[PDB]
Design an enzyme around this catalytic site. Structure first.
Site, mmCIF file in Angstrom:
data_model
loop_
_atom_site.group_PDB
_atom_site.id
_atom_site.type_symbol
_atom_site.label_atom_id
_atom_site.label_comp_id
_atom_site.label_asym_id
_atom_site.label_seq_id
_atom_site.Cartn_x
_atom_site.Cartn_y
_atom_site.Cartn_z
ATOM 1 N N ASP A 160 6.526 -17.392 -13.164
ATOM 2 C CA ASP A 160 6.543 -16.730 -12.018
ATOM 3 C C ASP A 160 7.888 -16.025 -11.830
ATOM 4 O OD1 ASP A 160 5.384 -15.645 -9.883
ATOM 5 O OD2 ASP A 160 6.261 -17.090 -8.435
ATOM 6 N N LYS A 215 13.044 -26.689 -17.645
ATOM 7 C CA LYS A 215 14.042 -27.441 -17.147
ATOM 8 C C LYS A 215 14.081 -28.901 -17.346
ATOM 9 C CE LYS A 215 17.946 -26.129 -15.501
ATOM 10 N NZ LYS A 215 18.418 -26.451 -14.088
ATOM 11 N N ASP A 246 17.651 -22.661 -16.886
ATOM 12 C CA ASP A 246 18.765 -22.141 -16.033
ATOM 13 C C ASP A 246 19.643 -20.855 -16.937
ATOM 14 O OD1 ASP A 246 21.486 -23.187 -17.781
ATOM 15 O OD2 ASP A 246 20.107 -24.943 -17.348
ATOM 16 N N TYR A 306 2.254 -25.025 -7.294
ATOM 17 C CA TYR A 306 1.161 -23.901 -6.811
ATOM 18 C C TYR A 306 -0.020 -24.499 -6.613
ATOM 19 C CZ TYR A 306 4.753 -20.183 -7.627
ATOM 20 O OH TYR A 306 5.754 -19.429 -7.520
#
Lengths: 403, 403
Positions: free
Chosen positions: B292, B217, B268, B150
């Site tokens: 987000d 992750k 996940d 971002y």
């Protein structure tokens, strides 16, 4: 020779990935570890019946069992034997049970070049569900399985490679990064994007699906996700013009939506709309990371994630498997639920064009679930006696014989 | 100036990131566009009542209106006037309605350095949910608001910039990459991760929470997400040793779970969990992109997204707003639902350490909704006649006068 190929068989073939199937296709299968031997042999039994009840000897899968994992080790001392690989590059289609990760799954994907991960998640008649109205969930996710920032191009903050990139960006791009930063390089391929978009539209045309939505956050990440959406549209129109219609066109002056609808939605509200209006989605197309996140949520929409099957398709070959681990704890006890691997078999049928037998399996399952003929992991909440692995498979067969 | 500052008010002296609030704090507010005026004034009415009913006249907020957006364009011919900026840098905390985008939202975040996006999401009572049992949903998401992909370091696949990067990765890193590739550099700051972890923990301590879970992750992106997890764990154990206990610690013997619990999970499967048993999450900590996406999934749990409030906190400042648009369609019709902004005002109260005021509002809202005294957005699904924006705020006010 470890294996003895079925002399009454014939390799499945491919033309532009069209996947042309003979009446007696040779299909490979790996039992897998833990519960695999049980759910898989049970799967192969229900599929054969689904084939004979739908085509009656006019068609028949000639199964060939190859070894991989702990069976291959405890017999040939190689967890993934050369003969097994030669059968894979030759027959190109495997229904494989779960295999531990003491890699075999990656090896197979790589050597067959299975780039597209397919995750069909539809609700089955009488199962528990966290949702109040799951009876509408009927979507299938198409994930490009080797494209997002999963390629592995990343470096620890205190590595010299990371220092090199930080120095680079600073004077060659006038981009300033702090030293305490971990760095990853997200790469979005045009070719990779187009390849998976073709599969998605193709599949929609073969099984007459109606909508193909593109999941993307191209409003913030313009040249990766944004580029993905652009290319997806590009090839969808430059190559499948007579088959699709952009949402912007029916929402315009050239409607007539009696064909595939290709549209897109920002990835932010995606997680909202699948939980509150799952009917809004049909076929979802998205990059590697999104698809890893979107699909897990998808399968949550309908409990019993271990009752879903998936695939890994390439330009010429495919691997089908249940979406659960080996459950070594329930091995050889005839307790495990074989629905997950049977559902991969169903998907394998769809890909094969054999939709009649695929549909039978689906109907048989729906029937059995609403009729309470289930394995212990479900009957626990359906307060009734649980059927064993073999018995559940036999109830499906027994049902299948009476459409 | 055009702003007559309250001479009986005091600046909130947040010195240690703790917020030191006087009995008469000066707080800025921006009405916002469309439904801004209506819903924000309603909020100010209910918040003063909660203050008064909880603290009598011992405390009172000294509201100071600053102009931004289209109102500032009409009155001052500047979307974000310099005077409005002086007040932001001076008083540093604002309650702001929604604002269109021809943005000032990002500008305020930047000039006050509000790096933390806080999203608490909890179920109400009579609110319809797409979830069968949304009852035990009491989450709060702590998102690092400017840290990874971002940051904007990306380039299209045909930019000379991207050519320079593809050349560098080849000759200097010796990594292979196609040319039809968009590029984005994911960055993860060790500093950024630590400052937001502190806020998270500092919040659990001051508000008697007891579980901070790290979303990441780290299983495929070890040097960014994985680094996020490592660094989060580090600052916790090093600066908040006497207040927290890792998951791995209790089970490895000495429990002492009479302190905040800290743990982590892969992203996940996190998206499945929030849907089937969201009670397992208290304070969720995660990087920019993850949070987000986790933010919309959750919140989509309770459904009425426009009734949620959020904040953007920095080391010494705060912006609070409803999580919804300006709804120009319902502007000036006394129909918009003010709950969202009010919830932001509630989150603001909490951050100020004025929990009594905060709890009044919360209980009031639950009582109004269980008693079907709501605006059109909700009445429509629960049989009775809707209350207007003003009337609804009035009901809350009479309700708080009782509890």
């Amino acid at each position: 020779m470890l294996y003895k190929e079925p002399e009454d068989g014939e390799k499945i073939k491919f033309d532009k990935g069209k996947w042309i199937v003979p009446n007696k296709p040779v299909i490979l299968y790996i039992e897998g570890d833990g519960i695999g031997p049980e759910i898989t042999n049970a799967a192969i039994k229900v599929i054969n019946k689904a084939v004979e009840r739908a085509y009656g000897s006019s068609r028949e899968i000639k199964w060939l069992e190859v070894y991989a994992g702990e069976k291959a080790e405890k017999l040939v001392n190689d967890r993934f034997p050369k003969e097994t690989q030669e059968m894979l590059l030759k027959y190109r289609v495997v229904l494989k049970g779960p295999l531990e990760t003491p890699s075999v799954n990656v090896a197979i994907r790589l050597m067959l070049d299975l780039y597209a991960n397919i995750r069909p998640v539809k609700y089955i008649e009488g199962l528990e569900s966290p949702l109040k109205h799951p009876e509408k969930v009927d979507m299938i996710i198409f994930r490009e399985n080797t494209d997002d920032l999963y390629r592995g191009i990343e470096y620890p903050f205190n590595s010299e490679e990371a220092k090199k990139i930080r120095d680079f960006l600073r004077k060659e791009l006038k981009v300033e990064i702090e030293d305490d930063t971990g760095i990853g390089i997200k790469v979005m391929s045009k070719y990779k994007t187009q390849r998976i978009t073709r599969l998605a539209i193709q599949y929609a045309i073969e099984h007459k699906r109606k909508k193909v939505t593109i999941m993307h956050k191209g409003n913030v990440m313009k040249y990766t996700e944004g580029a993905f959406r652009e290319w997806a549209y590009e090839v969808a129109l430059k190559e499948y013009r007579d088959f699709i219609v952009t949402e912007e066109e029916i929402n315009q002056g050239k409607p007539d939506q009696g064909k595939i609808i290709l549209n897109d939605r920002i990835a932010d509200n995606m997680f909202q709309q699948i939980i509150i209006r799952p009917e809004e989605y049909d076929i979802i197309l998205a990059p590697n990371v999104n698809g890893d996140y979107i699909s897990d949520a998808a399968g949550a929409l309908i409990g019993n994630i271990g009752m879903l099957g998936g695939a890994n398709i390439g330009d010429e070959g495919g691997m089908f498997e249940a979406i659960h681990g080996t459950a070594p704890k329930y091995a050889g006890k005839n307790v495990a639920n074989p629905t997950g691997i049977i559902k991969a078999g169903e998907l394998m049928l769809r890909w094969m064009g054999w939709n009649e037998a695929a549909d039978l399996i689906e109907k048989a399952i729906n029937m059995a679930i609403r009729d309470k003929k289930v394995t212990q992991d479900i009957a626990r909440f359906m307060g009734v006696k649980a059927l064993g692995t073999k018995e559940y498979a036999d109830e499906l067969i027994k049902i299948m014989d009476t459409i």
